[PDB]
Swiss-Prot record, chain A:
GO terms for biological process: potassium ion transport. Residues 137-219 form the RCK C-terminal domain. The channel is composed of 4 repeated units, each containing a transmembrane pore part and a gating ring part. The gating ring is composed of eight identical RCK (Regulators of K conductance) domains, in an alternating arrangement of one domain from each of the four subunits and four from the intracellular solution. Two protein interfaces between dimers of RCK domains from the pore-forming subunit and from the intracellular solution hold the ring together. One is called the fixed interface and the other the flexible interface. The flexible interface forms a cleft where calcium binds. The gene is mthK. This is Calcium-gated potassium channel MthK. Ca(2+) binds at residues 69, 95, 97. It comes from Methanothermobacter thermautotrophicus (strain ATCC 29096 / DSM 1053 / JCM 10044 / NBRC 100330 / Delta H). The chain holds residues 116 to 334 of 336 of the full protein.
């Protein structure tokens, strides 16, 4: 299991640091950033993220995921197309710079487009009186936070398979606040007391390391 | 009051989309963005966000907040120091693109710094197997959304002043999930059942608009 990162930016460096313990390959055109990348844990391949052969060297084939963040949206698209020539199944997460380009990146085969300025402009509009929402968002997204957001899979044969929210009583049982459940394409926020859990559902919750290790055991 | 935005970027443009109906002034040096700024519904002010006279004419004094997003680290700082010469209390929210400048912006007097690449990089590391967390983050922030995050202040004289989270029972009474309570410089995420609501607290909840309305009702003050 391993992750490939295409491009080196403030976003990808923060990504790399949030992926401590994990084996990672960074592919980028600028040799300058080797020790930055090495010292930062991961492995470095010097090359062009838009060149199939350079993606192959970076071990795109068979990767857990590929994260793409090139200098411009047009470059990002070219790299995606490149990864798709190599591996039709590997998960691609691409960063979009401009709103008009999001669908272009998914069209090229990105499974997910993260738009930092969308998120940021939305937080700006929410911070006109106080910083509580941004505070929330920034914090639950950090693995090093005390209370953080986590995804927990309901495996096949869990005590919760076919069990409603009300009965699982997860918050009281575990302390983890359930914010959502991911099931195939969709996210159900605020699962109603009615909701029946299924194997393969992803439980999105917020809790201390303590409450999380607990939920896993309940689960 | 009105909000002022210094600079024009993909972030401020999305911010305008979310400040509809609110009165907004954008002050920016690139006259080429004037057309985009007005179509988005802001008043455009051509000028230099690091110059007090241009900040004043963009109505910084007494604004509800000023959003700063400039490409230069040094211009952001100067813009913040210029805002502070005009108005010492106005809320200033500044965008950082490098970690390394977040403390300079604070030292300069920004009340809040938003760093898009911190949030982006964390979502990237969170999306390695699936996109549910990103789906959560951008959904809840969208003000044009089906269930979204909101902040609701606890007003002076609230039915809930001095009431426990447990007694309050906001989720089942209103449907709003309480994610946190903001009090002073602190966010209390998932407040314990022994936590006692005080006036001035800000409730962070997720819910449908009809549910937010009930919460607004559940917390209004009783005064003639």
């Amino acid at each position: 299991r391993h992750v490939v990162i295409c491009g080196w930016s403030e976003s990808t460096l923060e990504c790399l640091r949030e992926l401590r313990g994990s084996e990672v390959f960074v592919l980028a055109e600028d040799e300058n950033v080797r020790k930055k990348v090495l010292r930062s844990g991961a492995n470095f391949v010097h090359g062009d993220p838009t060149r199939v052969s350079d993606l192959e060297k970076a071990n795109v084939r068979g990767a857990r995921a590929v994260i793409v963040d090139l200098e411009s949206d047009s470059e990002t698209i070219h790299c995606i197309l490149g990864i798709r020539k190599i591996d039709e199944s590997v998960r691609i997460i691409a960063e979009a710079e401009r709103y008009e380009n999001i669908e272009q990146l998914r069209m090229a085969g990105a499974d997910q487009v993260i738009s930092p300025f969308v998120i940021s402009g939305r937080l700006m509009s929410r911070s006109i009186d106080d910083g509580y929402e941004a505070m929330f968002v920034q914090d639950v997204l950090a693995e090093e936070s005390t209370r953080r957001m986590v995804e927990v899979p309901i495996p096949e044969g869990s005590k919760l398979e076919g069990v409603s929210v009300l009965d699982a009583d997860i918050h009281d049982v575990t302390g983890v606040i359930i914010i959502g459940v991911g099931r195939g394409d969709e996210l159900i926020i605020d699962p109603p007391r009615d909701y029946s859990f299924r194997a393969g559902d992803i439980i999105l919750g917020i809790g201390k390391p303590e409450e999380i290790e607990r939920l896993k055991n309940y689960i």
